[PDB]
Design a protein around this ligand. Sequence first.
Ligand SMILES: C[N+](C)(C)CCO
Ligand SMILES: C[N+](C)(C)CCO
Ligand SMILES: C[N+](C)(C)CCO
Ligand SMILES: C[N+](C)(C)CCO
Ligand SMILES: C[N+](C)(C)CCO
Ligand SMILES: C[N+](C)(C)CCO
Ligand SMILES: C[N+](C)(C)CCO
Length: 300
Amino acid sequence: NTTGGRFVDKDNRKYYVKDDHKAIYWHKIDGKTYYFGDIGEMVVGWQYLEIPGTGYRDNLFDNQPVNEIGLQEKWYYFGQDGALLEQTDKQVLEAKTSENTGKVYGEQYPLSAEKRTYYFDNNYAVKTGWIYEDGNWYYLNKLGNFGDDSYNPLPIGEVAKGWTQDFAPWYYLDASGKMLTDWQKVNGKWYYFGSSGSMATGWKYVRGKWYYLDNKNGDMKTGWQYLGNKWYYLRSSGAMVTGWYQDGLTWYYLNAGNGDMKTGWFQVNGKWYYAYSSGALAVNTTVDGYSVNYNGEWVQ
Ligand SMILES: C[N+](C)(C)CCO
Ligand SMILES: C[N+](C)(C)CCO
Ligand SMILES: C[N+](C)(C)CCO
Ligand SMILES: C[N+](C)(C)CCO
Ligand SMILES: C[N+](C)(C)CCO
Ligand SMILES: C[N+](C)(C)CCO
Ligand SMILES: C[N+](C)(C)CCO
């Protein structure tokens, strides 16, 4: 693509000069790809740059008009010689930090960070999103942090850990980035991630039992829960109860199918029972005149 010029050392930097003009941005020179930024300085190592190939940031020299278009940006790695790493699969590289990113030929060595595995797309840019590796799903960040002036792209392409949203469904990656599935206890509470990994919220039927995960935060509930102007009792295991349930000495009746707590007179196998407005089963007394025995049965 670019020819007739020659690399030059000057002012502690490396430039590519052709006819007294410093190349800028993306250039392909004799089988290798380089990036010279907005004024010519040759880059090395980790770089967050506008994507190449369009023409708006390619084959340009400081003696030319630069289109105001603001192109998408992604991470790229350049060798210490400024040559782009044309990887389409994976590479072990040092964790992107503030010290080892955006540097240029002529600057001192960064500061060791820690080696990590980075995956790449078919155009040599760091890959983002979900990936399945060695039997597990990992989420490679697609977004950076904050906005405009204080925007931070460092997180992009990194393996996510802990609670993470996918832009929104929530997921939880373990200490090594592994996405959890099914029942998992996190911070002492239970969560159900099903088989796809997305966090369940609200009511969920799992293995023949009903459970209620916080409609917002997803954490499994237990004990008495007032849901939808109805009471339900969830065992310590979280599983919903149906039928008779004794809390202390007080009895309650959870609807045989839906599970909601009953109040008022109700029948169970022909026999009549009465529950107060709190659910407490009436026993050995009279209810509006009708006698109820020790089992709460309406006797004559
Ligand atoms: C793990 N994935 C999120 C990619 C699968 C469910 O869509
Ligand atoms: C991040 N979540 C709200 C999904 C977890 C509850 O702490
Ligand atoms: C069955 N759960 C996974 C909900 C917890 C009981 O230990
Ligand atoms: C457990 N159920 C989902 C059936 C009751 C709430 O509608
Ligand atoms: C006769 N009882 C009122 C006790 C039964 C509900 O119909
Ligand atoms: C036992 N309950 C929580 C259902 C009654 C309080 O009114
Ligand atoms: C189970 N009951 C609530 C019906 C009474 C004890 O037999």
